[PDB]
Amino acid sequence: KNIQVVVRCRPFNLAERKASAHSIVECDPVRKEVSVRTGGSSRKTYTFDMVFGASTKQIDVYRSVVCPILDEVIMGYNCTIFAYGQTGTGKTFTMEGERSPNEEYTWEEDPLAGIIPRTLHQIFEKLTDNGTEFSVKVSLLEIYNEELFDLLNPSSDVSERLQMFDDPRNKRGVIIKGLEEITVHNKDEVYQILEKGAAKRTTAATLMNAYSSRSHSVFSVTIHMKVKIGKLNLVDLAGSENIGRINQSLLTLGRVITALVERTPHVPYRESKLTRILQDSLGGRTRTSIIATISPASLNLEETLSTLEYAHRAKNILNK
Ligand SMILES: Nc1ncnc2c1ncn2[C@@H]1O[C@H](COP(=O)(O)OP(=O)(O)O)[C@@H](O)[C@H]1O
Ligand SMILES: Cc1ccc2c(c1C)CN(C(=O)N(C)C)C[C@@H]2c1cccc(O)c1
Ligand SMILES: [Mg+2]
């Protein structure tokens, strides 16, 4: 029912003790509280479904948040996970992850691997000896300036925008004409698909201003089981400093959440590509979770509070 919201604070980064700044964030995992030093000894505290402190490692996030959700997907449910927060707090780090330096590990064992890679690898492990018969297909579409880009098409230039239509076989669904859905036959072909995505994104960046920060990345994985059909959408949202208290999809997401939370009969899903595509994840029939990433630096006070207030109110959304 209620959408689950969790907070994840990134740890300090070298140049983060330079420009004068102290950790104004205190996370308490057992009490599921995040406390912020707002004083200029005053503070604001918020309780979430889960709170992960700066020391939280990727494996901890997967085990605690992802595994449970993946089991749901394998059961035939639709699930979505959002990463929301200002640029620089770890949205991509959490959803995608990074490669450890000096080629110390292969992708499947990289402790810095994020949610997407771990999920893909685990699907094959969990569905290997049990019942059996299943197929996995992934797609990675990114939204920038209300235009859709396919980061997985090999036979197309990343700059070819995609067009979406309402799904005549739906009502709340849309069709993304030309979207590449790649079949992942086995764990051994997962990484190359990610590298391909990584490459096309690099190209998109040279073409579009502040691309990686303003873009909304939607990595979807659909599992056909033999029956049952489960879909997991992993969404790395545009930086929240892109709104506040330009980016039509971000603005609309916030308005959609506001409408859902106040119980207003009209929810503006159609006012943006992002909300039309993810309509069923917002007060729909999909199980939704939001991971609000924040910074410990006193310099990010304002954005951190904004993010916490935004995510906190989101816990009042009911999906089904
Ligand atoms: N939990 C984390 N642990 C270690 N480094 C992190 C974490 N989250 C973010 N970082 C670092 O902070 C910087 C920005 O992370 P990034 O994922 O790009 O944020 P965002 O996607 O929200 O813009 C990079 O150095 C990234 O490795
Ligand atoms: C959609 C997606 C998901 C995850 C990830 C990338 C992309 C595009 C790109 N990455 C890459 O570094 N490349 C080069 C694919 C980072 C990353 C990842 C994958 C595997 C293991 C790991 O430790 C980090
Ligand atoms: Mg990012």
UniProtKB/Swiss-Prot annotation:
Residues found modified as N6-acetyllysine: 126
Annotated localization: Cytoplasm; Cytoplasm, Cytoskeleton, Spindle pole
Protein modification: A subset of this protein primarily localized at the spindle pole is phosphorylated by NEK6 during mitosis; phosphorylation is required for mitotic function.
Domain Kinesin motor: 2-317
Annotated binding of ATP, by residue: 85-92
Function field: Motor protein required for establishing a bipolar spindle and thus contributing to chromosome congression during mitosis. Required in non-mitotic cells for transport of secretory proteins from the Golgi complex to the cell surface.
Illness association: Microcephaly with or without chorioretinopathy, lymphedema, or impaired intellectual development: An autosomal dominant disorder that involves an overlapping but variable spectrum of central nervous system and ocular developmental anomalies. Microcephaly ranges from mild to severe and is often associated with mild to moderate developmental delay and a characteristic facial phenotype with upslanting palpebral fissures, broad nose with rounded tip, long philtrum with thin upper lip, prominent chin, and prominent ears.
Subunit details: Interacts with the thyroid hormone receptor in the presence of thyroid hormone. Component of a large chromatin remodeling complex, at least composed of MYSM1, PCAF, RBM10 and KIF11/TRIP5. Interacts (via C-terminus) with the kinase NEK6 in both interphase and mitosis. Interacts with RARRES1 and AGBL2. Interacts with TPX2.
Similarity section: Belongs to the TRAFAC class myosin-kinesin ATPase superfamily. Kinesin family. BimC subfamily.
Protein name from the UniProt record: Kinesin-like protein KIF11
Covered range of the whole protein: 17 to 362 of 1056
